[PDB]
Design an enzyme around this catalytic site. Structure first.
Site, PDB file in Angstrom:
ATOM      1  N   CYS A  23       0.815  -1.214   0.000  1.00 34.15           N
ATOM      2  CA  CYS A  23       0.000   0.000   0.000  1.00 34.15           C
ATOM      3  C   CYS A  23       0.852   1.268   0.000  1.00 34.15           C
ATOM      4  O   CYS A  23       0.600   2.200  -0.770  1.00 34.15           O
ATOM      5  CB  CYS A  23      -0.921   0.026   1.228  1.00 34.15           C
ATOM      6  SG  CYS A  23      -2.155  -1.293   1.315  1.00 34.15           S
ATOM      7  N   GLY A  25       4.233   1.166  -0.412  1.00 36.32           N
ATOM      8  CA  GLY A  25       5.505   0.859  -1.033  1.00 36.32           C
ATOM      9  C   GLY A  25       5.712  -0.634  -1.159  1.00 36.32           C
ATOM     10  O   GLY A  25       4.882  -1.421  -0.708  1.00 36.32           O
ATOM     11  N   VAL A  27       8.571  -4.161  -1.069  1.00 36.88           N
ATOM     12  CA  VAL A  27       9.487  -4.812  -0.138  1.00 36.88           C
ATOM     13  C   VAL A  27      10.408  -5.695  -0.968  1.00 36.88           C
ATOM     14  O   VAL A  27       9.971  -6.682  -1.553  1.00 36.88           O
ATOM     15  CB  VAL A  27       8.742  -5.702   0.885  1.00 36.88           C
ATOM     16  CG1 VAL A  27       9.748  -6.443   1.752  1.00 36.88           C
ATOM     17  CG2 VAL A  27       7.825  -4.855   1.755  1.00 36.88           C
ATOM     18  N   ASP A 127      -1.376  -4.189  14.736  1.00 34.44           N
ATOM     19  CA  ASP A 127      -1.669  -4.900  13.500  1.00 34.44           C
ATOM     20  C   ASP A 127      -1.131  -6.322  13.536  1.00 34.44           C
ATOM     21  O   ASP A 127      -0.587  -6.826  12.556  1.00 34.44           O
ATOM     22  CB  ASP A 127      -1.087  -4.133  12.314  1.00 34.44           C
ATOM     23  CG  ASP A 127      -1.614  -4.628  10.986  1.00 34.44           C
ATOM     24  OD1 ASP A 127      -2.695  -5.261  10.970  1.00 34.44           O
ATOM     25  OD2 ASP A 127      -0.957  -4.372   9.953  1.00 34.44           O
TER      26      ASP A 127
HETATM   27  N1  LIG Z   1       7.034  -5.932   7.591  1.00 36.43           N
HETATM   28  C1  LIG Z   1       6.189  -6.454   7.036  1.00 36.43           C
HETATM   29  C2  LIG Z   1       5.109  -7.136   6.313  1.00 36.43           C
HETATM   30  C3  LIG Z   1       5.658  -7.986   5.164  1.00 36.43           C
HETATM   31  C4  LIG Z   1       4.915  -8.117   3.996  1.00 36.43           C
HETATM   32  C5  LIG Z   1       5.364  -8.955   2.982  1.00 36.43           C
HETATM   33  C6  LIG Z   1       6.555  -9.656   3.127  1.00 36.43           C
HETATM   34  N2  LIG Z   1       6.847 -10.594   2.229  1.00 36.43           N
HETATM   35  C7  LIG Z   1       7.966 -11.310   2.171  1.00 36.43           C
HETATM   36  N3  LIG Z   1       9.024 -11.144   2.987  1.00 36.43           N
HETATM   37  C8  LIG Z   1      10.057 -11.997   2.959  1.00 36.43           C
HETATM   38  N4  LIG Z   1      11.094 -11.924   3.796  1.00 36.43           N
HETATM   39  C9  LIG Z   1      11.370 -10.963   4.679  1.00 36.43           C
HETATM   40  C10 LIG Z   1      10.689  -9.843   4.901  1.00 36.43           C
HETATM   41  C11 LIG Z   1      11.410  -9.222   5.831  1.00 36.43           C
HETATM   42  C12 LIG Z   1      11.109  -7.843   6.423  1.00 36.43           C
HETATM   43  C13 LIG Z   1       9.625  -7.468   6.474  1.00 36.43           C
HETATM   44  C14 LIG Z   1      10.549  -6.803   5.450  1.00 36.43           C
HETATM   45  N5  LIG Z   1      12.464  -9.966   6.154  1.00 36.43           N
HETATM   46  N6  LIG Z   1      12.438 -10.992   5.474  1.00 36.43           N
HETATM   47  C15 LIG Z   1      10.010 -13.069   2.073  1.00 36.43           C
HETATM   48  C16 LIG Z   1      11.061 -13.972   1.977  1.00 36.43           C
HETATM   49  C17 LIG Z   1      10.990 -15.017   1.059  1.00 36.43           C
HETATM   50  C18 LIG Z   1       9.880 -15.173   0.237  1.00 36.43           C
HETATM   51  C19 LIG Z   1       8.829 -14.268   0.328  1.00 36.43           C
HETATM   52  C20 LIG Z   1       8.907 -13.223   1.242  1.00 36.43           C
HETATM   53  N7  LIG Z   1       7.914 -12.332   1.309  1.00 36.43           N
HETATM   54  C21 LIG Z   1       7.304  -9.516   4.289  1.00 36.43           C
HETATM   55  C22 LIG Z   1       6.854  -8.680   5.306  1.00 36.43           C
END
Ligand SMILES: N#CCc1ccc(Nc2nc(Nc3cc(C4CC4)[nH]n3)c3ccccc3n2)cc1
Length: 264
Positions: A23, A25, A27, A127
């Protein structure tokens, strides 16, 4: 422009792949200083950095660790990398079929552990839910997304305590309510809670005393915990310290005669 020690130069970061739409940005998943693998939440600017503000104050093994913050535009925010993605995708994906009550209760215990820390620090998440819990190696789980987290001084209603949804009263106790809802996502392999009910219907129902019933195959003791978390009076809800200890000892103190089944 007086930045703190958390500040770093964009040149030390280089997002490789994308990890998700958002929403406020995206990631991404990149490399920091070309040696450390990291996650980056790209994209008001100062408001967007409020998650880093609070993330700078929080330090615990069960909370996704903040690494660095880029205060300029595009405003970034580097953090620890979790190789398994969100708990929600984990629960419904290929992995969900093999998770049983023992692994599910342990993941709940870990989340309860991160939230007990947040509790001691006198903060509020606001949340808490499976989409905001991240899974790593060895089934490690960590709380994330502190965009709405603040020092206690419409939100997804199905996960939000009624008093927080109606009157804006967000306390650690409204996070406990969310925890109970998170327990149902665990016990149902991530199904959206209150099946067939729409927001307005959920709000009215809950207010009238309605509560989700015992998920199929989930022990009554666990469902009772969920019900303590959904007590109408915010104050009669358990603490996270209690939730952490109850969950950690669950198979010896509460369900010593537990027997694996087809789903849980
Ligand atoms: N904050 C928040 C909500 C939020 C929303 C969506 C995501 N999707 C996310 N993330 C991953 N790995 C992550 C994410 C993080 C930190 C949060 C940024 N560390 N490792 C990840 C690793 C592998 C495959 C899919 C993945 N998909 C992650 C977090």
């Amino acid at each position: 422009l007086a930045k703190d020690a958390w500040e770093i130069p964009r040149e030390s970061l280089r997002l490789e792949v994308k990890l998700g739409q958002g929403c406020f940005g995206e990631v991404w998943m990149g490399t920091w200083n070309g040696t450390t693998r990291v996650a980056i939440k790209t994209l008001s600017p100062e408001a967007f950095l409020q998650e880093a503000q609070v993330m700078k104050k929080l330090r615990h093994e069960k909370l996704v660790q903040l690494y660095a913050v880029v205060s300029e535009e595009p405003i970034y925010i580097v953090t620890e990398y979790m190789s398994k993605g969100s708990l929600l995708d984990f629960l419904k994906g290929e992995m969900g079929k093999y998770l049983r009550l023992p692994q599910l209760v342990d993941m709940a215990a870990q989340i309860a552990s991160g939230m007990a820390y947040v509790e001691r620090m006198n903060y509020v998440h606001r949340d808490l839910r499976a989409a905001n819990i991240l899974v790593g190696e060895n089934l490690v789980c960590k709380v994330a997304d502190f965009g709405l987290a603040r020092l206690i001084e419409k939100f997804p209603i199905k996960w939000t305590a009624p008093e927080a949804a109606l009157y804006g009263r967000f306390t650690i106790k409204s996070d406990v309510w969310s925890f109970g809802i998170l327990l149902t996502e665990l016990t149902t392999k991530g199904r959206v809670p209150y099946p067939g009910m729409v927001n307005r219907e959920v709000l009215d129902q809950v207010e009238r005393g309605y509560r989700m019933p015992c998920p199929p195959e989930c022990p009554e003791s666990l469902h009772d915990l969920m019900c303590q978390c959904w007590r109408k009076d915010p104050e009669e809800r358990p603490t996270f310290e209690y939730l952490q200890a109850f969950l950690e000892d669950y198979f010896t103190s509460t369900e010593p005669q537990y027997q694996p089944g087809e789903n849980l």
